[PDB]
């Protein structure tokens, strides 16, 4: 109810990382600027936690970053950095903490995951995944974290790993039908949706959804356009695919998937053009 979409950083039309922060209101369909981040960051991830926006790692065009900055939803300020420089990492929240896994530090793709406690402003290293992954999102469903696809430095991946906080271990679940890197991922009505990405040859408009109860993937109606390094978030029971790269140009549009009609609609074409930005939801 009155949630909005937030999009930060990424790769802009001047072919460099940017600092632009925008919010989109699906109801009014209006965009607006927020205060710019301090360091320009592409390949960056964002989460929201208790009316706080976090912008995590990324890449300034020179080095991969472990630094993190925060905005109270306003002025941006620096908090404790991660232990690993990470571009194109997955990021999510679970029980008042941030989890970040995988990524690329300019030399190695990571298996590692670490966790942020806002109560003490510290990042703690957790268990490694089985496969090193850049370009893989994180998604939480019912207390458990899923890391989907990505790229290990040699192959685009269709494998999916599951982290159980009760065991502290990663295990495997049934893989996606398509190898995907740079896809957007979100939970919608207890299904994990994976939109777009890159399969090694083509930039994808295809979409798959994972039924967690039955451990099975099924094909979903494709998006209006291919989108790689695209963000995905759910608002009011609908799935949004934000900006990205269609294989030719940067995109400024957001399209919205509605299960009632089982189709994708463009809901705006007026954002800044960008890809590998970070996205999250704000409760106003």
């Amino acid at each position: 109810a009155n949630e909005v979409l937030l999009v930060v950083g990424g790769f802009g039309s001047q072919q460099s990382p940017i600092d632009v922060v925008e919010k989109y209101d699906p109801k009014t369909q209006e965009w607006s600027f927020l205060p710019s981040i301090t360091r320009k960051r592409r390949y960056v991830a964002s989460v929201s936690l208790h009316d706080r926006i976090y912008v995590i790692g990324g890449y300034d065009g020179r080095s991969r970053l472990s630094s993190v900055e925060c905005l109270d939803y306003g002025v941006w300020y620096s908090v404790a950095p991660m232990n690993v420089r990470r571009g194109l990492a997955g990021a999510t929240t679970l029980g008042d903490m941030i989890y970040v896994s995988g990524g690329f530090d300019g030399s190695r793709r990571h298996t590692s995951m670490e966790r942020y406690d806002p109560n003490i402003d510290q990042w703690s290293m957790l268990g490694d995944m089985q496969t090193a992954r850049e370009g893989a999102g994180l998604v939480v469903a019912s207390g458990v974290i899923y890391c989907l696809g990505g790229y290990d430095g040699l192959n685009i991946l269709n494998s999916v790993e599951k982290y159980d906080p009760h065991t502290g271990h990663w295990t495997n679940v049934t893989p996606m039908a398509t190898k995907r890197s740079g896809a957007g991922v979100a939970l919608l009505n207890d299904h994990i949706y994976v939109v777009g990405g890159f399969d090694g040859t083509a930039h994808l408009s295809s979409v798959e959804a994972y039924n967690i109860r039955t451990d099975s993937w099924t094909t979903v109606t494709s998006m209006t356009t291919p989108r790689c390094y695209v963000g995905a978030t759910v608002l009011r029971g609908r799935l949004y695919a934000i900006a990205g790269y269609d294989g030719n140009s940067l995109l400024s549009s957001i399209e919205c998937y509605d299960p009632i009609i089982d189709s994708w609609e463009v809901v705006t074409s007026m954002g800044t053009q960008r890809c590998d930005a970070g996205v999250c939801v704000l409760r106003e």
Partner: peptide
């Protein structure tokens, strides 16, 4: 890979 697949990016700009």
């Amino acid at each position: 890979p697949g990016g700009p």
